Structures are given as structure tokens and as C-alpha cells.
């Protein structure tokens, strides 16, 4: 992993992250010079366009939707779904299938 | 399918030490049936034989069920007087029995001559040569040489037969992407050719009497006599084209005008007999209507 993210950080430092493909904090990794400008002018234009797009874009009573509208509720809905638990049980049963395969030579 | 299993606790028997993977321990019999078998080989051999016995004694039920089930499925399909194949409800199952409408007890393995040979070898072997007078003198009698070498009608006929064989080669290459010439077809043409040689004492050392245009024409009328899908309207003659495409390719190539002068050396009488023979032996291969092909297939 040789090429570095090298994007201009808000602190004036260039990123030293050694990711093969993408920077988690700067999107796709493009080759940058010692001062962080991408070598390809077209890549620089695309990055500038992406940055510009990103920059552009009974009350006194409790609302039950507050609990329903939260990350934890969403995750609980996703994981505790009948389909999801069924897939989990299937995978764990295949794990059981391997520990059933732990008797090769003998009768088992 | 595996060596003897460890039925004791990591032992095949109590005569061996544990975790013994040697050949003796898992059941390798290093004795002939004439030298005897030592007691452990006797036991392991008994186990193997028992597998065989149970197999013979437990396959049979399922196979019997399959036989019954297929029979009841297909039983009432039969070949009709229309030459079609139909079921009891009278719906079509096959417009012609087996896509060519022949019985199965009269076909036999044959071998397409033109499928495999290279383009140059096919050129060399199946293209009649009417220019070299040497070979024509060696193979054809004098008069035939005169006519074959002067006339241009004859020469064009021969070039047309080669054109048709080239077309056939491409059609075969389409049908048989893998180049296997083993195909099963009604009349055995190599054997009929050999028979005809023997019946008429065809000396392969003297120039022959057969006129190559006789070969071309006689084969054409023959191909017209071998009728599977009768009729005259366009649809019936397209069907008759298709039903015998491959027998006609094979016939037209083996029964060529060059092969027949360099390989078989038949004479005019022999050729007439051969054509009559192919016609009859073909006409006796056709399915007899009323044949119960469903029960036969099942």
C-alpha cells in the first residue's frame, strides 16, 4: 500500500492514510502531489464539483414518533425481523453441520 | 467407498493398536484366494461382501416402481396411419417417429465420411478430376475417357455434385459441432458396396465401365424414391427434405462419382443392383403404423 490519501485536511495537513482504494474521509483516492492537488486536472475538477455539491447540500406534549424515529428503533426493526432471525438460525445450523462433520474416521 | 471404518474406539478391531492407519489395519487383503485369508482379512472381506448383498437386496423396489410409473405414463402413444405419433386423446406428440420415422431394429451404426476431413483433404478426395488424362485412362475405359474429357455438360454436372457436397459439409458442421462421425442410419452402404463387388467379381485392377454421370443421375432418382413424408404441396416436400437430410448427405457422399471410380470400381450392372438394394432396404425400415412406441420406449 504505497499511495496515500494526501487530501487537504482542515488542519492544513495532508492525509497519510494507507487505503488501497478509497479514503473513508475523502472518498475515492486519486493520486495527489506533495501539496495535495490531484495530478489529473480532470480528477481535480471532479473533486471540486463533488465538494461544491456537498457544501450546497400539541408541541408541548411528547411525540411517540420520537422513539419510533431513532437509530436504535430502526436497527431493532431490521435485526428483529422474522426473515433476519430465520437467516441467522440457518447459518448457525450450518455451523452445526460442520461440528457434525467432526467425526471422519469412525462410525460417526 | 471408504476403507474399513473405526467401529471400536479408534480401532477397526481389538487386535490392532489405536490410531493405526496402516494397510493391514483398515482392510487391505494381501493374499490371493488360493493362499487363504488370515482371520482379520476374513472379517473385513465379510463386511465388504455384506455391502454387496444388501445393495442387491434393496435396489430392486425403487427400480420396479420407476418401471411401473413410466409404463403407465407413456403406454397409449402409438404410430398412426397418418404416420404421426399420437396419444389416446388424439393429440400430436411427434409429427414423425423419432424425427425420421424409422423403426429401431433396422438401423445400425455408420460413419459420415465428410464431417472430419480437412478442407484440403476433402478437396483432394471428393472432387472428381476431369483434367488429368493419366488417371482417367487407368480407372475409366477408353470411351468413357473420351466423353468425360471432351464434353462440357458432363464437366459442369461433376462440378455441381462437388458444390452440393460442399454445402452438405457445412450443414453437418452445424449439426455436429463435435466432430463425431458415428451416426446410426438405415442402410449399410459400405457393406452393400462390398457385397456388390463380390456378387459381380469386380476386379479392382482393371479400368471400370461405369459412366460418372450414371452415378450422378441414378443417385438423384434414388433420392427421389426414398419418400418418408409423402405429398407434393410445398409443406410436404419441405418435410420430406428434412426427414431424410442426413441419410441423403451420407448416401450422396459415399456413393460419389470419384469414390466410385477410385475406391469401389463398380460396373454398370453392379450399380443398378446396388440402387435397387438401397431402395428396398430403406423401405423396410419405416415404422409400421399401429406400433405401440410408448410401451416400447418405456
Amino acid at each position: 500500500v504505497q499511495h496515500w490519501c494526501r487530501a487537504p485536511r482542515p488542519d492544513g495537513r495532508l492525509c497519510e492514510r494507507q487505503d488501497r482504494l478509497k479514503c473513508p474521509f475523502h472518498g475515492k483516492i486519486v493520486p495527489r502531489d506533495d501539496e495535495g492537488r490531484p495530478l489529473d486536472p480532470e480528477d481535480r475538477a471532479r473533486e471540486q464539483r463533488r465538494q461544491l455539491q456537498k457544501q450546497e447540500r400539541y408541541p408541548s406534549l411528547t411525540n411517540l414518533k420520537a422513539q419510533a424515529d431513532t437509530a436504535r428503533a430502526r436497527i431493532g426493526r431490521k435485526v428483529f425481523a422474522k426473515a433476519a432471525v430465520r437467516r441467522v438460525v440457518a447459518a448457525m445450523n450450518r455451523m452445526d453441520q460442520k461440528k457434525h462433520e467432526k467425526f471422519s474416521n469412525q462410525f460417526n | 467407498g471408504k476403507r474399513i471404518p473405526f467401529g471400536f474406539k479408534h480401532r477397526t478391531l481389538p487386535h490392532f493398536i489405536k490410531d493405526d492407519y496402516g494397510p493391514e489395519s483398515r482392510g487391505f487383503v494381501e493374499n490371493s484366494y488360493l493362499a487363504g485369508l488370515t482371520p482379520t482379512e476374513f472379517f473385513f472381506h465379510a463386511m465388504g461382501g455384506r455391502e454387496g448383498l444388501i445393495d442387491t437386496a434393496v435396489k430392486t423396489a425403487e427400480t420396479g416402481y420407476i418401471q411401473r410409473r413410466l409404463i403407465k405414463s407413456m403406454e397409449s402413444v402409438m404410430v398412426k396411419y397418418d404416420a404421426t405419433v399420437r396419444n389416446s386423446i388424439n393429440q400430436v406428440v411427434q409429427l414423425r417417429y423419432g424425427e425420421d420415422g424409422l423403426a429401431g431394429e433396422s438401423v445400425e451404426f455408420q460413419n459420415l465420411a465428410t464431417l472430419k476431413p480437412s478442407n484440403k483433404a476433402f478437396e483432394k478426395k471428393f472432387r472428381f478430376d476431369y483434367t488429368n488424362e493419366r488417371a482417367l485412362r487407368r480407372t475409366l475405359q477408353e470411351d468413357l475417357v473420351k466423353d468425360v474429357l471432351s464434353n462440357a455438360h458432363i464437366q459442369n454436372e461433376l462440378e455441381r455434385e462437388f458444390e452440393r457436397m460442399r454445402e452438405d459439409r457445412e450443414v453437418l458442421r452445424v449439426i455436429f459441432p463435435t466432430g463425431d462421425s458415428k451416426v446410426v442410419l438405415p442402410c449399410n452402404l459400405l457393406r452393400m458396396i462390398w457385397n456388390a463387388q463380390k456378387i459381380f467379381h469386380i476386379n479392382p485392377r482393371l479400368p471400370s465401365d461405369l459412366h460418372p454421370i450414371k452415378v450422378v443421375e441414378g443417385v438423384k432418382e434414388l433420392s427421389k424414391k426414398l419418400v418418408i413424408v409423402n405429398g407434393d404441396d410445398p409443406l410436404s416436400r419441405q418435410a420430406q427434405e428434412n426427414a431424410t437430410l442426413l441419410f441423403n448427405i451420407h448416401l450422396r457422399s459415399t456413393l460419389c462419382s470419384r469414390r466410385m471410380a477410385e475406391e469401389f470400381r463398380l460396373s454398370g450392372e453392379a450399380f443398378d443392383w446396388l440402387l435397387g438394394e438401397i431402395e428396398s432396404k430403406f423401405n423396410q425400415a419405416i415404422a409400421h403404423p399401429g406400433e405401440m412406441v410408448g410401451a416400447l420406449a418405456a
Binding site: A84 | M74, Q91, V93, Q94, K116, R169
Partner: protein, 284 residues
Amino acid sequence: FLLGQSARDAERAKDILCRLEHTTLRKVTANTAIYYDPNPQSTVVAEDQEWVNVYYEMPDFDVARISPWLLRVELDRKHMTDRKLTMEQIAEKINAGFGDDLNCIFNDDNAEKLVLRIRIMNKMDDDVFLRCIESNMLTDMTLQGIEQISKVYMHLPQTDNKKKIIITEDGEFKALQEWILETDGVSLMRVLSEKDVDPVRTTSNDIVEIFTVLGIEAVRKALERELYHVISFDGSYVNYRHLALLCDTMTCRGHLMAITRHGVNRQDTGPLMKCSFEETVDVL
């Protein structure tokens, strides 16, 4: 059947292989643990603290929203490479599936131990909750490939029956010794539509799935093929008329008909033949 140069060199074929095979997260995870870390700046673990503080100082993702509860997961190298795969894509997938609620971060693919962290960031408590997330992630987070395709094999077929047969410029036939993939699950719909998967020759031995994906004449030819292979496996021989008649009887109505009381006894044969075959009382 591979299409391009992938037929010849092994590496391209192996690329396509890993691009078909299903790779859930379990297959590429070494070990996991649910820690209790209130302060990211001071992890309980020492060996991770470097890249930890390399990430948490820069505030792209809030530290206040983060819960004290942690998942830490260990990836093992040789598995991690076998699928020609890197933490970037796994990070990507975990972002995709759960969205943004599940924070993820991960070190660089240089440390001897390949590590990344999924501590959440926003009935059952968070201790139970992160166990549920762990189980769900390990079970059904698809990283690659196509479900219901477990393994995928590769070989150069000795028998000409599977080799690539071509007509050279001289008109002579010549078989080629090239790369194939024999799988273990079946999803033909997807597997056809892929880069360098030859969509003209790749088949399957599962006639129903063909019949759904290719129609009724496709399944007629396929049914012929499977039967011929079963019968003539042991060198035996059976004429073709009989095999063709069985196949054509069995597809003559447009749908696949089974040779059973369900398919044979449900067509329009008239009551008496039906009662003869099976299930007499109901029929009559």
C-alpha cells in the same frame, strides 16, 4: 464457461470465481469481542490505540453521539486475501446496509493483525443489542458474490466432452484445454449476466430452473441431455427414439409434467385409465 482470455490464464478465472462465490462476513472474520470503552482516546486494548487516536482526533464523526459500548472484530490475513479483498469494501458494505447509525472505522492493511471497530453511534440493553448486531452481521452480511452459490471449482477438462471444440482455418476440428467453473449452488438467472461468463454455453443440471429461465424447448433439450448422461454413464447404450419419445411426452403440454400421480393423473386421460394407474377412489 468463461468467455475471453479468462478461458486461458488461471488468474482471471480465479478473479471471476471469487466474484461469483458468496462471501459472508463470518468467512473472513477471525474473532470478535464486545468491550466497554467510554473513552475512545483511551481504549482498553493497547495495540489498537495508535490507529484509534489517528482516527478519533479528527471530528468528521461526532464523539458525543457515540455510545460507550463497543464491537471489536479481528480479520485474519490469508482468508482476507483469498477473496482478493480489503477493509475498504467491508467498511463500504457496513455503511450501505445499516446506513450511518453504525459507525465504522478500520486501520490500514499493513498491521500483522487486521482489525476494525464498529462501536455504535446515536427492551434489550446495549449489551444484548450489540450481541444481536454481531450475530446479524456475521450471519447475513454479504460481501461478494451471489447467494445460494456455496463453493466454486475450477479445472481443465480432460474429457473432450467439456473442452472447447473449434473449427480451425483448415476446416479441421481442434479441442482447446481451458478453464471452467463448476459451482455448488444454482442461480442461473444472475450467473448468465456477468462479465466474461459465456452466456451461450453455460448451463445447469437443474431442469426446473432452466425451464423458468429459458422456456420449454430449452428444457426439452436439457432433459434429453441429463437422461442420456445418466443412462450412458456406465457405457451402456439406448437408442434415441425412446429417449426422445419420453422427453416429448413429458413436455408436450407446455409445462413440465412429472411422471407421478400429480402430473400423469391430472391431465385429460379420461377417468378409467386414471383409476387404473393410481389413486382409484378419488378419481372415480
